[PDB]
Design a binder for this molecule. Structure first.
Ligand code: SF4
Ligand code: SF4
Length: 214
């Protein structure tokens, strides 16, 4: 559990404009800029050089402080790789060029339920797991609007709060007993033991099982 996370997902805002029935959203608003600043300071103290995204289960382009937050990543963690995951409904050409200049290296746009292109990827939405490994808690930290740290993007209900960055350094949370044993337990495939993982049907995302098939 020594290796730092390679991706951190930050819920800079919790609302999304869509109502996708397949999404946890169906069925506060924005992250305190002070809270985002202490996260930047912590990530800066680690010389963080992995990926950073701005979407948990909300639409980042709805965040009124998005430009500020993106600009701060370039100041605090210029080695990191800022990525926007967005439904695209707010992504005008102007926002795109502005966000790119501020530091975003990639936009992953997903046309969802309803209704710079080198840096734009366009997608369109369109039991026995008890022993499966999973490497997500070894690679990914999630930070919610209120600062809670989760081991996975699946934990919408925050069953596995590892700590809170408003109260503790994210490196210390990442390396605490609870997070360390969890990622070890999931690396060994003990999904059945976790209330988060035991019913999870992730088979392709950071699993040994992923080399097979298709
Ligand atoms: S656009 Fe994405 S985050 Fe928003 S409701 Fe749909 S699936 Fe959920
Ligand atoms: S098994 Fe599922 S819920 Fe558990 S850490 Fe992996 S992806 Fe997340």
């Amino acid at each position: 559990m020594d290796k730092l996370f390679s991706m951190i997902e930050v819920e800079v805002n919790s609302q999304c404009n869509r109502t996708c029935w397949y999404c946890p959203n169906s069925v506060t608003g924005e992250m305190d800029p002070a809270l985002y600043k202490t996260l930047m300071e912590q990530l800066s103290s680690l010389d963080f050089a992995g990926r950073i995204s701005f979407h948990f289960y909300g639409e980042p382009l709805l965040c009124k402080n998005l430009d500020l937050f993106v600009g701060m990543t370039t100041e605090y963690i210029p080695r990191a790789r800022p990525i926007i995951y967005t439904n695209g409904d707010f992504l005008t050409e102007k926002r795109l060029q502005t966000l790119t200049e501020l530091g975003i290296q990639k936009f992953i746009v997903t046309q969802h339920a309803g209704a710079d292109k080198e840096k734009v990827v366009y997608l369109d939405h369109s039991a026995s797991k008890a022993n499966m490994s999973c490497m997500v808690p070894s690679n990914l930290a999630v930070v919610t609007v209120l600062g809670n740290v989760l081991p996975c993007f699946e934990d919408f209900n925050q069953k596995m709060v590892m700590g809170n960055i408003g109260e503790q350094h994210i490196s210390d949370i990442w390396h605490n007993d609870k997070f360390t044993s969890f990622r070890k337990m999931l690396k060994e495939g003990h999904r059945g033991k976790s209330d988060l993982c035991k019913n999870c049907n992730n088979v392709s995302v950071q699993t040994e099982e992923q080399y097979d098939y298709v």
